[PDB]
PDB file of all heavy atoms in Angstrom:
ATOM      1  N   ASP A  64     -81.714 -42.717 -10.942  1.00 65.26           N
ATOM      2  CA  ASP A  64     -80.850 -43.412 -11.888  1.00 65.26           C
ATOM      3  C   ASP A  64     -79.519 -42.690 -12.128  1.00 65.26           C
ATOM      4  O   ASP A  64     -78.488 -43.345 -12.315  1.00 65.26           O
ATOM      5  CB  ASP A  64     -81.569 -43.552 -13.230  1.00 65.26           C
ATOM      6  CG  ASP A  64     -82.590 -44.656 -13.239  1.00 65.26           C
ATOM      7  OD1 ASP A  64     -82.703 -45.388 -12.240  1.00 65.26           O
ATOM      8  OD2 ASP A  64     -83.286 -44.794 -14.268  1.00 65.26           O
ATOM      9  N   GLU A  65     -79.569 -41.355 -12.161  1.00 68.67           N
ATOM     10  CA  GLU A  65     -78.410 -40.516 -12.437  1.00 68.67           C
ATOM     11  C   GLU A  65     -77.419 -40.587 -11.270  1.00 68.67           C
ATOM     12  O   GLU A  65     -76.221 -40.828 -11.465  1.00 68.67           O
ATOM     13  CB  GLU A  65     -78.822 -39.050 -12.672  1.00 68.67           C
ATOM     14  CG  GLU A  65     -77.649 -38.150 -13.025  1.00 68.67           C
ATOM     15  CD  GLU A  65     -77.954 -36.660 -13.015  1.00 68.67           C
ATOM     16  OE1 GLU A  65     -79.088 -36.234 -13.307  1.00 68.67           O
ATOM     17  OE2 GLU A  65     -77.019 -35.887 -12.732  1.00 68.67           O
ATOM     18  N   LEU A  66     -77.921 -40.349 -10.061  1.00 67.25           N
ATOM     19  CA  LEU A  66     -77.095 -40.396  -8.868  1.00 67.25           C
ATOM     20  C   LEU A  66     -76.441 -41.773  -8.640  1.00 67.25           C
ATOM     21  O   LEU A  66     -75.410 -41.849  -7.991  1.00 67.25           O
ATOM     22  CB  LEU A  66     -77.909 -39.968  -7.652  1.00 67.25           C
ATOM     23  CG  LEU A  66     -78.515 -38.557  -7.696  1.00 67.25           C
ATOM     24  CD1 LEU A  66     -79.487 -38.356  -6.539  1.00 67.25           C
ATOM     25  CD2 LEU A  66     -77.470 -37.465  -7.706  1.00 67.25           C
ATOM     26  N   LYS A  67     -77.026 -42.845  -9.162  1.00 70.20           N
ATOM     27  CA  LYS A  67     -76.382 -44.173  -9.104  1.00 70.20           C
ATOM     28  C   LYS A  67     -75.031 -44.245  -9.870  1.00 70.20           C
ATOM     29  O   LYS A  67     -74.179 -45.105  -9.588  1.00 70.20           O
ATOM     30  CB  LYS A  67     -77.331 -45.267  -9.611  1.00 70.20           C
ATOM     31  CG  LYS A  67     -78.527 -45.537  -8.715  1.00 70.20           C
ATOM     32  CD  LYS A  67     -79.225 -46.839  -9.100  1.00 70.20           C
ATOM     33  CE  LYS A  67     -80.488 -46.961  -8.275  1.00 70.20           C
ATOM     34  NZ  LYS A  67     -81.111 -48.294  -8.355  1.00 70.20           N
ATOM     35  N   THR A  68     -74.840 -43.342 -10.831  1.00 69.43           N
ATOM     36  CA  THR A  68     -73.606 -43.266 -11.609  1.00 69.43           C
ATOM     37  C   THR A  68     -72.620 -42.283 -10.963  1.00 69.43           C
ATOM     38  O   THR A  68     -71.607 -41.908 -11.565  1.00 69.43           O
ATOM     39  CB  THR A  68     -73.882 -42.827 -13.086  1.00 69.43           C
ATOM     40  OG1 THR A  68     -74.289 -41.451 -13.118  1.00 69.43           O
ATOM     41  CG2 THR A  68     -74.958 -43.711 -13.755  1.00 69.43           C
ATOM     42  N   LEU A  69     -72.929 -41.830  -9.757  1.00 69.33           N
ATOM     43  CA  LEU A  69     -71.942 -41.072  -9.016  1.00 69.33           C
ATOM     44  C   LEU A  69     -70.925 -42.007  -8.360  1.00 69.33           C
ATOM     45  O   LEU A  69     -71.259 -43.068  -7.822  1.00 69.33           O
ATOM     46  CB  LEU A  69     -72.569 -40.118  -7.995  1.00 69.33           C
ATOM     47  CG  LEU A  69     -72.720 -38.678  -8.495  1.00 69.33           C
ATOM     48  CD1 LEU A  69     -73.786 -37.926  -7.732  1.00 69.33           C
ATOM     49  CD2 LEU A  69     -71.421 -37.909  -8.404  1.00 69.33           C
ATOM     50  N   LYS A  70     -69.678 -41.561  -8.450  1.00 68.51           N
ATOM     51  CA  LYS A  70     -68.466 -42.209  -7.941  1.00 68.51           C
ATOM     52  C   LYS A  70     -68.260 -42.093  -6.409  1.00 68.51           C
ATOM     53  O   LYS A  70     -68.177 -43.096  -5.669  1.00 68.51           O
ATOM     54  CB  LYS A  70     -67.263 -41.566  -8.681  1.00 68.51           C
ATOM     55  CG  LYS A  70     -67.554 -40.145  -9.312  1.00 68.51           C
ATOM     56  CD  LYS A  70     -67.982 -39.087  -8.245  1.00 68.51           C
ATOM     57  CE  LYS A  70     -68.064 -37.662  -8.802  1.00 68.51           C
ATOM     58  NZ  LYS A  70     -68.104 -36.655  -7.682  1.00 68.51           N
ATOM     59  N   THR A  71     -68.168 -40.853  -5.945  1.00 67.18           N
ATOM     60  CA  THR A  71     -67.911 -40.586  -4.551  1.00 67.18           C
ATOM     61  C   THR A  71     -69.194 -40.858  -3.788  1.00 67.18           C
ATOM     62  O   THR A  71     -70.269 -40.473  -4.246  1.00 67.18           O
ATOM     63  CB  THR A  71     -67.493 -39.123  -4.401  1.00 67.18           C
ATOM     64  OG1 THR A  71     -66.475 -38.857  -5.371  1.00 67.18           O
ATOM     65  CG2 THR A  71     -66.988 -38.796  -2.970  1.00 67.18           C
ATOM     66  N   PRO A  72     -69.100 -41.599  -2.668  1.00 66.43           N
ATOM     67  CA  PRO A  72     -70.149 -41.577  -1.654  1.00 66.43           C
ATOM     68  C   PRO A  72     -70.586 -40.140  -1.357  1.00 66.43           C
ATOM     69  O   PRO A  72     -69.727 -39.252  -1.180  1.00 66.43           O
ATOM     70  CB  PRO A  72     -69.442 -42.182  -0.435  1.00 66.43           C
ATOM     71  CG  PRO A  72     -68.453 -43.216  -1.062  1.00 66.43           C
ATOM     72  CD  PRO A  72     -68.223 -42.784  -2.516  1.00 66.43           C
ATOM     73  N   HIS A  73     -71.904 -39.909  -1.359  1.00 67.98           N
ATOM     74  CA  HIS A  73     -72.493 -38.588  -1.087  1.00 67.98           C
ATOM     75  C   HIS A  73     -73.513 -38.711   0.022  1.00 67.98           C
ATOM     76  O   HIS A  73     -73.968 -39.805   0.329  1.00 67.98           O
ATOM     77  CB  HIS A  73     -73.188 -38.020  -2.330  1.00 67.98           C
ATOM     78  CG  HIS A  73     -72.253 -37.413  -3.335  1.00 67.98           C
ATOM     79  ND1 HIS A  73     -72.059 -36.043  -3.452  1.00 67.98           N
ATOM     80  CD2 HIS A  73     -71.459 -37.988  -4.271  1.00 67.98           C
ATOM     81  CE1 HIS A  73     -71.180 -35.807  -4.410  1.00 67.98           C
ATOM     82  NE2 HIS A  73     -70.805 -36.971  -4.927  1.00 67.98           N
ATOM     83  N   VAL A  74     -73.859 -37.594   0.648  1.00 68.20           N
ATOM     84  CA  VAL A  74     -75.038 -37.591   1.489  1.00 68.20           C
ATOM     85  C   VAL A  74     -76.150 -36.967   0.652  1.00 68.20           C
ATOM     86  O   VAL A  74     -75.941 -35.955  -0.053  1.00 68.20           O
ATOM     87  CB  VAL A  74     -74.832 -36.870   2.815  1.00 68.20           C
ATOM     88  CG1 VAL A  74     -76.135 -36.790   3.596  1.00 68.20           C
ATOM     89  CG2 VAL A  74     -73.757 -37.592   3.644  1.00 68.20           C
ATOM     90  N   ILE A  75     -77.310 -37.632   0.683  1.00 67.03           N
ATOM     91  CA  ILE A  75     -78.410 -37.285  -0.188  1.00 67.03           C
ATOM     92  C   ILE A  75     -79.674 -37.193   0.600  1.00 67.03           C
ATOM     93  O   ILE A  75     -80.132 -38.143   1.223  1.00 67.03           O
ATOM     94  CB  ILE A  75     -78.632 -38.344  -1.306  1.00 67.03           C
ATOM     95  CG1 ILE A  75     -77.346 -38.556  -2.107  1.00 67.03           C
ATOM     96  CG2 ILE A  75     -79.829 -37.926  -2.225  1.00 67.03           C
ATOM     97  CD1 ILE A  75     -77.469 -39.673  -3.109  1.00 67.03           C
TER      98      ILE A  75
END
Side-chain angles (χ1 to χ4, degrees):
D64 282 355
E65 183 191 329
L66 301 170
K67 291 194 186 192
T68 70
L69 263 158
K70 21 60 171 196
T71 311
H73 281 259
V74 175
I75 304 174

